């Protein structure tokens with residue numbers, strides 16, 4: 001039975017290594033697929049810098065900071081927000097990165113998060 005939050009260590013991928021550059025074709029589908037890949041352990045994270053988003057596919061799924069007061073165990077509390085054509089679905093804090101499927105790419109680091117399973 002699903003707790004409200006789950007501790008995960010997400011592999012951080014470089015954008016040019018990512019083979020599957022998004023989760024789907026609609027805001028509702030990308031949030032659904034992101035959540036399922038997170039449960040299956042097949043989700044990576046790309047940190048956002050200049051040049052990154054134009055190399056990925058919309059709609060985007062971002063993990064954003066949900067609580068600026070405590071970060072339990074070094075796991076920052078986060079929630080999902082999708083973006084399509086400049087419009088965001090959800091409101092949250094600072095972006096930690098953009099989520100993508102992970103299909104065996106070698107990561108450069110891991111990001112510890114406490115994910116709100118909304």
Ligand SMILES: C[C@@H](N)c1ccc(I)cc1
Nearest residue numbers: 020022023042101102103
């Ligand atoms: C089942 C497996 N081949 C797979 C990997 C990545 C995605 I996205 C969907 C399915």
